[model samples]
Target chain A: KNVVIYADGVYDMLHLGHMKQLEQAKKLFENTTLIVGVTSDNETKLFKGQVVQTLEERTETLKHIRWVDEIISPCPWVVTPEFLEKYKIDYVAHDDIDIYAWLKRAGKFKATQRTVSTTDLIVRILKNYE
Target chain B: KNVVIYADGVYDMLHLGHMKQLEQAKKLFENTTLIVGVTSDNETKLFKGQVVQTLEERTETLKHIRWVDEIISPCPWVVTPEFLEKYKIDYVAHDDIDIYAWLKRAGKFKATQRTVSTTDLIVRILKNYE
Candidate 1:
């Protein structure tokens, strides 16, 4: 059986950093299937306390990527265990978030983590000297 | 001398993943100044072929972030050396872009790049099953 990998996020800007990460993830697994969960505008507001883009905008960004296989709306918080079971996802992968903790708690599938640095750059660029 | 870091993007859907990255970047150097350049709605459409949210919406979302000290409108494509000089920027930082290439060609401010994986995860999650 092929290894099924699941990753999720609301891709708003679709930068080169995102593209490179997708490229890396695809190379890690044979027959890797990518599932993208675009959070609704409402969800973004609820969770992040602000909305940067509409759901349609985020979804549209995800559709253009070749690495993406399926696009779905993720419920608030992490992808729930119920959804994981339904999809029969063999491996859960992410650049951020603690996959090991989720794996320990969920115990339904194996989890792998990738390292990326876009976020650090964002914060660094935003810091104030004063 | 203060290091002025300029970074640009849509920032449509802010998340904890974003928060953590910003936090990490802020701690990188002393006297670091962060300037966020948010792309306009029209800009996102023309370049990315999608509009996730209105420019006002994206700006408002960025305003709430504590890590972000100042936000400006980016002129699309790479941040030109002209803009950097105008802003008196000392450094440019990004997660994905080839900073060295730009730095070599522009020979302006110092450019630093960090690694982040949220994008890779987005692509990994969206990969199709079939």
Candidate 2:
């Protein structure tokens, strides 16, 4: 079965923290297609309050990553209803609240399931390093 | 007139790069009330792809900054249209694009607006230091 995995973010200064997440994400599916949706500079400012790197800079960094199968830009905060309908996305990988539970609470629960967050690993590293 | 300036991000490893942006943002309006909105651990993953610092750590660093007037948690992206309407935000300080401009046409812009980016400064400092 073909498995579609969706993930999105600014991914500025692409560092080990990012790689850890992608590596783990790739391992989750048997046949994985990674859709890396980058937040545009405008969205970055709206969401992040500041843009760390330019789109060109961010694009160049993401293009070289081996795990990424596809790259998308101008994505919204949550997997929009439009994206859900258009992509027929099989799985949406979120590190935060369970998408399923959230959708369930919001009364829009569907096929998606929550997966492991790289933030857990990141916290571990930060604690050890400090 | 009271002005609410909402800014938020990881602010990992607090560096001069962040300071410059904050300094400029502070000067943008009179009686600037800076609200440094920090991304929750969960939201950071969805947006940043990596977590460099913990919430407590990030908060400790931010608390010391003199420019900041107030800080809020779990603020939604773009101050939310509801926030815009409710807070009566005199002006939203966004470096990416004109906040009042076409929300659709306003493409993603970079973080640092000033030509003298601290990244460039760091590079020069590194090059000369080396």
Candidate 3:
């Protein structure tokens, strides 16, 4: 209830892995307002060809999932302290990623981790090409 | 209505990877009844010392996931035609592993994949120990 649980990602293909983290994020508080920051078109510039869905399409897809209480469109790739203040985020949940170094926020939780990140998953999918 | 979905695995420490397959398996049909076969201790021995939780615990966990409609406690490692017959499974959903070579009767659907396998997940968790 006290923590404004936040998780940000591209959610390009929107797999169950995304749902898994969001589900776990809800359990951390008595009243959960899980906010997902889906990386936008401008943000997807970092990944280039990796993105499969447009921001609008991804946003619509994300809204269908029950666990996601809210979504931030065109979210920053590196969430800053000011960004946290804007959203009133009590805790930002994410993978322990190097990109998050710029995040100087209310509080940070490495709430998401998988044996494989989306980058690695794509590599595995394309490994046979090599 | 059109597909008899079947997914079988040890499901030890069941994660999003497993749920992804079950969810994907449901979409292939109008009316989906997902029958997940939880590999028994006798079957999981093929993986040697990899099992984390007991079969009973894992089975209980698998039952709770809404996507799964049924659970087989002592499923075989290599699915036989007779096994599919008893369960009335027309299609077997899985992650395209080599062990499914024994499946003769049911249609095979590779409903899941990830950069890391369950074994690899455990490896990464203990890599620092090594």
| Best TM-score among the predictions, by candidate number | 3
| DockQ, cand. 2 | 0.01
lDDT of 3 by residue, A1-130 (tens): 3668888888765544665666777667788788989887865866654465578767765665657788898787777778888998878777664556555432465456643233444355457587
Mind giving the per-residue lDDT tens digits that candidate 1 earns over A11-116? 6555545655555555566777777667777667776765444676566555555566777765345777677778877666666445357665664344344432
Clashing pairs in 2: A41-B108, A42-B108, A51-B111
Q: Which ten residues in a row have the lowest lDDT in candidate 1 chain A?
A: A108-117
The TM-scores, chain A only, for the candidates as listed are 0.70, 0.72, 0.75
True contacts kept of each: 0.00, 0.00, 0.00
TM-score of chain B of each: 0.71, 0.68, 0.75
Off by over 4 Å in 1: A1-130, B97-100, B104-130
lDDT of 3 at B74: 70
lDDT per residue as tens, model 1, B33-80 = 777788877777787876544676556555545466677854355677
Q: Residue A1 of candidate 1: its Cα lDDT? A: 47
Superior candidate under DockQ, 1 versus 2: 1
Residue pairs in steric clash, candidate 3? Answer: B1-B31
DockQ of each: 0.03, 0.01, 0.05
Error of 3 at A59 (Å): 14
lDDT of 2 by residue, A1-130 (tens): 7776777778765544565566556556789887778888987888677665677666655654557777786567667767866876666664653445754465443232332233343456658565
